[PDB]
Design a protein around this ligand. Sequence first.
Ligand SMILES: CC(C)c1cccc2c(-c3ccc(Cn4cncn4)cc3)c(C(=O)O)[nH]c12
Ligand code: NA
Ligand SMILES: [Zn+2]
Ligand SMILES: [Zn+2]
Length: 231
Amino acid sequence: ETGDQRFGDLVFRQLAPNVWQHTSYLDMPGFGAVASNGLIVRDGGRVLVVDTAWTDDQTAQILNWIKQEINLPVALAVVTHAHQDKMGGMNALHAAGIATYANALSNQLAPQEGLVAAQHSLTFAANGWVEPATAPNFGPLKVFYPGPGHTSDNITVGIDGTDIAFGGCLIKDSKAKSLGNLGDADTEHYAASARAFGAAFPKASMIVMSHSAPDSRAAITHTARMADKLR
Ligand SMILES: CC(C)c1cccc2c(-c3ccc(Cn4cncn4)cc3)c(C(=O)O)[nH]c12
Ligand code: NA
Ligand SMILES: [Zn+2]
Ligand SMILES: [Zn+2]
């Protein structure tokens, strides 16, 4: 659509005045060319990234796009679990000198997953909110661990000052026929974790997610319902 700017085999879509969705694609036998989404946030004179693309080369295109279209330094990136669609491009971020952050558990898992760990580890209070001293300079990004679901390590991100909350791999859209790739999922706890995400960001009306276009809060409801069926 008109909002879907094309650049370097990726797609960039403005969602709010200072927020864009990045989308990259990986062709895999049996799956088609699977889209994965992350975010780009301008916070004053700097840019913040949520999630890499599937590959280093694609993630380099995210950074090229930022330079062309925003032309401000990228201060940090936060990646939302140790799977290829979210952390496949860590080397590109590190080649740009960008400080990278992930759940401590994601950093522990990354090497066995064939991924490069983020430089910095986030830890979370018992109620799920990030311990702020582990998320220095996060600006409007509000990071929440909802519990195991799509993976054990999945985290979520709200953008303060906007209507947006990012569910990453945890949340699928209201028309989705399944929960996507459950290979590393916690099927017992998924429904509660999806609901915890919704309760952490109760003001959010635009739910952004890894594998479908932004949706209403019906994405959370429908995801939790599909997840309840797994119990
Ligand atoms: C583990 C990771 C590297 C990976 C590889 C290949 C596919 C996926 C998917 C995925 C699979 C199917 C669909 C189709 N679909 C659309 N809405 C509901 N299902 C969507 C995503 C996910 C995911 O679910 O995070 N991770 C993936
Ligand atoms: Na909220
Ligand atoms: Zn995943
Ligand atoms: Zn995914």
